[PDB]
RNA sequence: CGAUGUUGGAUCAGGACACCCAAAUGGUGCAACCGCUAUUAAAGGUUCGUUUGUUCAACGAUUAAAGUCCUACGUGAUCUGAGUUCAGACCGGAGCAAUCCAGGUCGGUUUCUAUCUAUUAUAAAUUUCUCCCAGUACGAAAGGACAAGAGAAAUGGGACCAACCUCACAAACGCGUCUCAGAGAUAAUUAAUGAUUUAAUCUUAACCUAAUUAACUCAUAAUAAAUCCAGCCCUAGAACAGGGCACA
RNA sequence: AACAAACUCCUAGCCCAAUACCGGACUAAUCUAUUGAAACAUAGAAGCAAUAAUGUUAAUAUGAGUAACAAGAAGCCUUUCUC
């Protein structure tokens, strides 16, 4: 029975799961856009969201300093986080990262892939799923309803 | 024609998505939501447990006559909590468009005598139940999936340490040597939990008017935040308790006086109480 | 346990041609509006993501060329410019990534 | 085996023998040899009986072909269009005469199982049984529980 | 082997079918099959059950005449039995010899 | 008129109808009186169902059988009818259906004494 | 005999009644309570320990009782191997010896990946123990009731985490909590009316009757709105299915 | 009464069941002696006929796409992280 379980089984146990997600978070912090399996990236998204919230607490906060020391295993990334990522994310509360589904790997595994990235990264944009324009037929027909609702008030 | 699949959010643009988003008679039962559980205390000092059943949106949907449903009692159709338009089916939205109400989650059928019929499209409230009464509660129980025979039926297992090899949870012998088969009534591992069960004879202690919350005594089958089918008790000892109830149904408009906020049974220790002492 | 009799080809055909063991059709195949290739509706286009991945690999290689150490990371923000472009006043104070090829149609200035 | 082979009804083609009898055998072609010992019965049949058979049956055409063949054959073709091979290899003269007479007395249809040993057209003289041919009529044509 | 044995049983099966058909078409006239058979034989009419079923299927008036003959012979035999005498000999109880 | 069925002799209490539901302890032997009390068409349905030959046409030919407990037939069925078969048993009438002409026509067998009480 | 693997237990039990308990009665050398027999009824139960490999058996504490059997004296393609039933070894005895034992003791490999049949959850309770009945009925006293009514528990079925406990996941879990039912029907046995047999007499004589066990059915409860299903979540789930994705 | 055989009649015949053993008439496929030359005849010879030996060799099926096997992570691709 898996009722009320939010953490999925990864690696060789809980410690190995924490270490693999630590490696993924270190790579995401260093490169600002990484691709991996869909489940590992989906687990990584919450860690990457709360890491920005811990970096928001300031450089002088000892708990955040030790959290970043443990989780960012390459020691150059802690000044990089506290002087790049935390000043850049100030206004928005929880919109730090983007998760998108990459097509399956060309290796024989045919695993389901996802790419994770941060906002404002210095990289070319991913081919985001664009909505229809407002000149499209259904959008124009609904803008007619919107105009008649504005004319009714 | 190899037509592709579509949904409501496919062809909508970001400027239009928030635009789219913007003596022998029987009574009528309710559909509620199991909120949680609370302690409660009585004036003799004992402690009971109440399950919280919140009515959020309860409306009678359609009425099936006596001769077209069962031949003894008519059928009244009651819907549950209100869900989205976009994820329901076309015929369901068409019949609810003719009815006049937004889509409901669960749809249930109640057996109701002809003198207790309610015109369809009528809302219902928790003051339909009065403090001090006995109710029957029907719900889908907590689904435990494909469970073994030890958890599903309660069989004693084989010992663990005394040499037994690959045996510790298996049922063992399932049938008899002569009959050369296994009986249809044999207890065997399989699906456990996702079935419709009814608890009988649950006592109501308190009705909360504004949030429409019924407090029932004991355990309600099913997990928290599901939809729960509530009716009166069909036990033989509680047959004739219909007389002191508001029995067309509860009408808040016809009374034209306000009910109290919290309606209690006379044995309940209130939150506002003299902090009872003995003598 | 050992089988008692050989399964015949009629029963084998019934087992192996049953519709739950067949490959189901996919109705979410759509054409990409940019390149005209094929993609699923909930999945990014492989051709477009290959372009983005190759440009990202080129950018990452050329910025790893500028820094000679594995343990040296930028203290400030990074900006990228192509041939025929100059860093802006709001882009000053940030490290500069120069590339010789022309700026793509998909990649904006910002 | 009836379930293994095909079946046909008893049928006379062109309604033979009704107005007049027409011998439906058209031709025989014998393929024999002058040298082989297996063609001996065919050779003696050619010497004695073929001319008398031709006098008895003026409606058939008899061809004789002495060619260097090992197995003597006779091929009978009918008015229906049917062709039938027969092997006359190493048989006595009376056996050959019996075989030719049996081929002459046949109609030419396919020799398979006959479903029924009779054929009839219009068998429904003086009516045919239907469930109402013996049930008496009720006054007014009434149903048993219908009231008028 | 089943072909030869079912060829043997074919005559019995077809005979049983003929008896069922004669029983049906005789009970349709309100006369039982054994009474119909023995009273048709007692009039020196020797038709086998194949052609009797054939008359029963394709020949309703002729089978009605045969059933009437059998019923008349049955009533004549019952009358001659209850008479207890040799002097009354009926019109259909007379016995015709070969010539 | 399936409800008005009659058994010769004591078959109403002696004759049983039995079935098994498959589960252990699921053997039901119901007396014919109780079975006719519960389901009136069950007796005639099981009699025809047992008497019909045991081939696969059996289910198909009970699909053409219609059984009604009393004289309440649908009109679509009523307009389909052709003829009514005669009943196989001549129903005996009681004393009250006999007319007084038949009562005085039947001779008196014996002469009772006048001093007796009936 | 080109193999039908054997005792006891572990798990699961199906059935019969020649019934141990529970229930309805008849006779008693039946005053009451204990008893002894006889009839009907198999929906449900029939305990925990010491010794022995034990089935049995003895004993300790109990219970409403600790039933007799069939099921390859059920069940080893679910298990156990203590004994039997291999190969090693002692003691008593027989045999000159090798060896022998319904004569004892230590130790002694228990395979299988399921092809086919079969099967893989609807309910509508049961039994004890207290208080009254009352120390009333019945009795010379010792003794000592049945029925009716209030309560508690336990067993079994179905469920659930407000608290305790397991608990370093929001959950699962018990050691914790909640609920558990009306009508008809009967077998044996008592009666009312009344003929053959104008008395009587419960009737394989009718007519209407009652008093009455367990089953068994049915009131009653559950399911019981057809064709949007790409993706995401789920207290829903092996896969497939199922419920949500407008509030916020 | 009826329905009901390998019994018995009817119409034709090539005119009466069988294990171990015994007798007889034919004949499938080769070689040879003479015929024959769209593949046969009369004779002389045998390595002279396979639905069966847990038969031998070879290829296939069923069990079965079942049991079972493996490469730590990211990236600038051989540079850093976790054991
Ligand atoms: N000794 C003997 N055995 C016979 C005789 N007839 C038949 N048998 C035996 O019977 C068996 C065959 O019987 P069937 O299967 O032919 O009825 C064989 O064992 C065969 O040897 C006989 O006459 N004498
Ligand atoms: Mg794993
Ligand atoms: Mg679940
Ligand atoms: Mg255990
Ligand atoms: Mg072991
Ligand atoms: Mg183990
Ligand atoms: Mg083992
Ligand atoms: Mg069997
Ligand atoms: Mg014959
Ligand atoms: Mg043996
Ligand atoms: Mg064998
Ligand atoms: Mg049992
Ligand atoms: Mg007792
Ligand atoms: Mg008994
Ligand atoms: Mg029992
Ligand atoms: Mg023990
Ligand atoms: Mg055994
Ligand atoms: Mg025995
Ligand atoms: Mg025995
Ligand atoms: Mg054993
Ligand atoms: Mg084993
Ligand atoms: Mg076994
Ligand atoms: Mg030993
Ligand atoms: Mg040892
Ligand atoms: Mg297994
Ligand atoms: Mg299977
Ligand atoms: Mg008492
Ligand atoms: Mg006293
Ligand atoms: Mg319980
Ligand atoms: Mg009297
Ligand atoms: Mg008396
Ligand atoms: Mg029911
Ligand atoms: Mg759904
Ligand atoms: Mg015969
Ligand atoms: Mg013979
Ligand atoms: Mg013999
Ligand atoms: Mg030869
Ligand atoms: Mg050979
Ligand atoms: Mg061969
Ligand atoms: Mg083998
Ligand atoms: Mg072989
Ligand atoms: Mg295969
Ligand atoms: Mg696979
Ligand atoms: Mg398998
Ligand atoms: Mg596997
Ligand atoms: Mg490995
Ligand atoms: Zn594209």
PDB file of N, CA and C in Angstrom, chain C residues 11-24:
ATOM      1  N   UNK C  11      -4.973 -22.087 -30.782  1.00  0.00           N
ATOM      2  CA  UNK C  11      -4.934 -21.454 -29.466  1.00  0.00           C
ATOM      3  C   UNK C  11      -3.793 -20.445 -29.392  1.00  0.00           C
ATOM      4  N   UNK C  12      -2.660 -20.760 -30.032  1.00  0.00           N
ATOM      5  CA  UNK C  12      -1.534 -19.829 -30.064  1.00  0.00           C
ATOM      6  C   UNK C  12      -1.865 -18.565 -30.851  1.00  0.00           C
ATOM      7  N   UNK C  13      -2.600 -18.701 -31.957  1.00  0.00           N
ATOM      8  CA  UNK C  13      -3.028 -17.544 -32.735  1.00  0.00           C
ATOM      9  C   UNK C  13      -4.018 -16.698 -31.951  1.00  0.00           C
ATOM     10  N   UNK C  14      -4.935 -17.356 -31.227  1.00  0.00           N
ATOM     11  CA  UNK C  14      -5.882 -16.640 -30.373  1.00  0.00           C
ATOM     12  C   UNK C  14      -5.175 -15.874 -29.264  1.00  0.00           C
ATOM     13  N   UNK C  15      -4.101 -16.445 -28.717  1.00  0.00           N
ATOM     14  CA  UNK C  15      -3.357 -15.759 -27.666  1.00  0.00           C
ATOM     15  C   UNK C  15      -2.541 -14.595 -28.221  1.00  0.00           C
ATOM     16  N   UNK C  16      -1.821 -14.817 -29.320  1.00  0.00           N
ATOM     17  CA  UNK C  16      -0.870 -13.825 -29.809  1.00  0.00           C
ATOM     18  C   UNK C  16      -1.472 -12.799 -30.760  1.00  0.00           C
ATOM     19  N   UNK C  17      -2.728 -12.950 -31.175  1.00  0.00           N
ATOM     20  CA  UNK C  17      -3.378 -11.946 -32.001  1.00  0.00           C
ATOM     21  C   UNK C  17      -4.489 -11.224 -31.253  1.00  0.00           C
ATOM     22  N   UNK C  18      -4.541 -11.385 -29.936  1.00  0.00           N
ATOM     23  CA  UNK C  18      -5.555 -10.734 -29.124  1.00  0.00           C
ATOM     24  C   UNK C  18      -5.263  -9.236 -29.033  1.00  0.00           C
ATOM     25  N   UNK C  19      -6.294  -8.377 -29.069  1.00  0.00           N
ATOM     26  CA  UNK C  19      -6.059  -6.922 -29.170  1.00  0.00           C
ATOM     27  C   UNK C  19      -5.349  -6.272 -27.990  1.00  0.00           C
ATOM     28  N   UNK C  20      -5.356  -6.881 -26.802  1.00  0.00           N
ATOM     29  CA  UNK C  20      -4.578  -6.318 -25.705  1.00  0.00           C
ATOM     30  C   UNK C  20      -3.079  -6.534 -25.873  1.00  0.00           C
ATOM     31  N   UNK C  21      -2.664  -7.514 -26.671  1.00  0.00           N
ATOM     32  CA  UNK C  21      -1.251  -7.710 -26.968  1.00  0.00           C
ATOM     33  C   UNK C  21      -0.809  -7.026 -28.257  1.00  0.00           C
ATOM     34  N   UNK C  22      -1.722  -6.385 -28.982  1.00  0.00           N
ATOM     35  CA  UNK C  22      -1.358  -5.649 -30.184  1.00  0.00           C
ATOM     36  C   UNK C  22      -0.827  -4.265 -29.833  1.00  0.00           C
ATOM     37  N   UNK C  23      -0.147  -3.651 -30.797  1.00  0.00           N
ATOM     38  CA  UNK C  23       0.373  -2.298 -30.626  1.00  0.00           C
ATOM     39  C   UNK C  23      -0.747  -1.308 -30.919  1.00  0.00           C
ATOM     40  N   UNK C  24      -1.043  -0.447 -29.951  1.00  0.00           N
ATOM     41  CA  UNK C  24      -2.130   0.515 -30.073  1.00  0.00           C
ATOM     42  C   UNK C  24      -1.701   1.693 -30.935  1.00  0.00           C
TER      43      UNK C  24
END
